[PDB]
Design a protein around this ligand. Structure first.
Ligand SMILES: NS(=O)(=O)c1ccc(C(=O)NCC(F)(F)C(F)(F)C(F)(F)C(F)(F)F)cc1
Ligand SMILES: [Zn+2]
Length: 257
């Protein structure tokens, strides 16, 4: 029964999910002065040429664009990662206004939204096994600021009216997630967790330094989605972000000087 409200929001998650107070929780504030350049990191390899999107689903907390991950089509490799991570879905977190919405922050700055491209380590064979491992997932995080429209985001924006409420889905084939990437792949990386229950500590985070720009009209349409199911009292899907968590005994590394 968790969600984002007063009564069921991030401050309450620890009661059903005690790992909420664990040692490697996400998101975190990225203090740009404290993150150390690690000349040993690699260039990330984002290989999305063969990506096969299938469906888009309003799950009551966000919407997921789902991919065929039955074999190695769209994969993330390199950077801080060992081995091959298959793209399974992407989704966003966003705010009620442009001044909040991201989960990670940069020197305490909140972006209007944050995209997460979720990938799982194929050495564990399936996603449900991968989330039980400390190196099971790699989530590529991309900040959104409001300015010029992002042309590669418009197909997502235009299907949202058809999945307004929890449990609705729509066919969503042939979507190219390369159109959501910024120009630079410079990133910060640290070990963390899923940012929604069950909050599993299984994620290598890779957060791109360069935000993408989306238009105010684009993000306004995210904010017309609903957390509720069909016919239920309307609760706009906004502010579905978890705040920054304590860094504890972790190091955030930069891939760039
Ligand atoms: N915001 S995020 O950090 O990018 C992010 C990315 C992905 C998930 C996600 O797959 N939750 C769903 C889930 F994994 F928890 C799961 F239900 F599928 C599960 F596999 F653990 C379970 F519970 F065993 F079935 C959550 C947060
Ligand atoms: Zn997320």
């Amino acid at each position: 029964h968790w969600g984002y409200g007063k009564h069921n929001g991030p401050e309450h998650w620890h009661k059903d999910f005690p790992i909420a107070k664990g040692e490697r929780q996400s998101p975190v504030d990225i203090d740009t002065h404290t993150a150390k350049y690690d000349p040993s990191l690699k260039p990330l390899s984002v290989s999305y040429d063969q990506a096969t999107s299938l469906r888009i689903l309003n799950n009551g907390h966000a919407f997921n664009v789902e991919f065929d991950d039955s074999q190695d089509k769209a994969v993330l490799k390199g950077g801080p990662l060992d081995g091959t991570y298959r793209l399974i879905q992407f989704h966003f977190h966003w705010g009620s206004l442009d001044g909040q919405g991201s989960e990670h922050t940069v020197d305490k700055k909140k972006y209007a939204a944050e995209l997460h491209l979720v990938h799982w380590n194929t050495k564990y064979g399936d996603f449900g096994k991968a989330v039980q491992q400390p190196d099971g997932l790699a989530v590529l995080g991309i900040f959104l600021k409001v300015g010029s429209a992002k042309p590669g985001l418009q197909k997502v924006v235009d299907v949202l009216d058809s999945i307004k409420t929890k449990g609705k889905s729509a066919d969503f084939t042939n979507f190219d997630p390369r159109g959501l990437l910024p120009e630079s792949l410079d990133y910060w990386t640290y070990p963390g967790s899923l940012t929604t229950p069950p909050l599993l500590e299984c994620v290598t985070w890779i957060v791109l330094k360069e935000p993408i720009s989306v238009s105010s009209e684009q993000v306004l349409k995210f904010r017309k989605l609903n957390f509720n199911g069909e016919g239920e009292p309307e609760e706009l899907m906004v502010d579905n972000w978890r705040p920054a968590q304590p860094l504890k005994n972790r190091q955030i590394k930069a891939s760039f000087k």
